[model samples]
Target: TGCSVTATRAEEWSDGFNVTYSVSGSSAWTVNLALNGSQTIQASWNANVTGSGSTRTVTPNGSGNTFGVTVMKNGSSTTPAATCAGS
Candidate 1:
């Protein structure tokens, strides 16, 4: 399947957020996010995420895999504000 972006909740954030990802199968990809005037952020597989805003990227980890993201904004003390999957 071609990679595409899908969100659990879509909204703009200014206060920042915490992001995480999950990989499926053996199809590798990258996640890049550019939001709130920050530089684009990239993550391959399970990587540490510092700071946040909005955006994503997908590419082969050079193997073959699929991935997604889970974000928790600063103001939201509850569940993740956003969750996205791309492969």
Candidate 2:
């Protein structure tokens, strides 16, 4: 079965927010996120992130199925949607 991913807003600030992703149904997973137009990723943990702009590809670093990202916004603070696939 494919992996399932759920995103939560763990923290928030005036200019930025922290998102936590929980994964299940697979030991190895990759998550894809597309942020709002004015949002960008500032930091991440428990995963390696790639891509640029609003699109991000996240892969767990053998640390577990949970990962987090910090997003900085220029205009809006809307949370991004996330999807996952197993390998």
Candidate 3:
């Protein structure tokens, strides 16, 4: 099969938002997320994140298929696009 990732806006506020990513088709995977405009990641949980600027790479910290991130926006609440691949 193939790996796939889906993103959802789990919560939102005036200056920030929270997104959750669900992974399927693989137990070992990595996900890349591109944020909109000047949005930046403030914090994350259930995963490990790296990279800079508008793009970030996320990988599972342990044995889980879900991860979440908190983003700080630039005057707008927009969701990032996430792509996944199996390792």
Candidate 4:
């Protein structure tokens, strides 16, 4: 985590949604978004998450947004070493 970004609900956030998550055994190969936006979200996890070795990011569309997270592996399918995800 470079810098912590705060994601809130009922505020209708437009930008500044920077968060990271790590998989278990494999690096982050592909991340699929559940939706573009959500309503009265409990947490922040949306159409984001950069493809890299292990770390990833997700940006929500609005304040109250719900999303489904799709995680992919590098080659086969391995869980990340450390799964540190926050919003």
Candidate 5:
């Protein structure tokens, strides 16, 4: 039950941009991303389907969007990734 979560800016679309994330733990984990401290999105991983290679994509409104990703195990504890917001 040990791994890390990371959020990376994928591509800039017409209006907003898409971000991709990767987790390195069991599939029974939760991934959360917050945008501008107001909007946030959550995703889950199922080791049964994707194994430990779980990834999720998020689209955020453009205009200097600042965001961060937090990951936690369903039945265990975790330390948030050191990666903060990336413009």
Candidate 6:
């Protein structure tokens, strides 16, 4: 499943924000996604981009809003677009 880039709560997304979140053991999601086994598909900028010791984690809080997230089979050509509020 894939969502969009926003900092709003998950509930608001029910209106259709465009986010992607598919787990290895989930059944479905708000933004229906078509993914494989553990694919590093780009997540919606919904949540803020988190940072670990090595990699980054983007968890939306429903603030900044994005345009779309392309699910590439193998290297997608679509670019990430969004309109973040308050920077």
**Candidate lDDT (C-alpha), each:** 0.38, 0.82, 0.82, 0.31, 0.35, 0.31
Superior candidate under lDDT, 1 versus 2: 2
Compose the digit string of candidate 5's lDDT tens values, residues 1-87: 443556565444333444445544333344433333222223322211112223333323332123333333333222222232222
Which run of 10 residues does model 4 get worst, by summed lDDT?
A: 33-42
lDDT of model 1 at position 82? 25
**lDDT pick, better of 3 and 4:** 3
* TM-scores vs. true structure, each candidate: 0.28, 0.90, 0.89, 0.26, 0.39, 0.22
Q: Count of backbone clashes for each model?
A: 10, 0, 0, 11, 0, 24
Model 2 lDDT, residue 87, Cα: 65
Candidate 1, residue 7: the lDDT equals 26
- The per-residue C-alpha lDDT of model 6 at residue 32 equals 25
1 or 2, greater by TM-score: 2
Best by TM-score: 2
lDDT tens digits, residues 1-87, model 1? Answer: 433422233333564333433344434334444433333333224333344345544444454333333333444422232222444
Clashing pairs in 3: none
User: Where's the lowest-lDDT run of ten residues in candidate 6?
Assistant: 7-16
Cα lDDT tens digits, model 6, 1-87, are 343323221222312223333222212212222333222344445434433232333333444222123222243322222222221
- lDDT score of model 6? 0.31
User: Where does model 3 exceed 4 Å of error?
Assistant: none
- Candidates 3 and 6, the one with greater TM-score: 3
For candidate 4, give the lDDT of residue 83: 20
Off by over 4 Å in 2: none
Reference-based lDDT, residue 29, model 2? 90
Candidate 4: regions farther than 4 A off: 1-45, 73-87
Q: Rank the candidates by TM-score, best first.
A: 2, 3, 5, 1, 4, 6
Q: Residue 64: error of model 2 in Å? A: 2.5
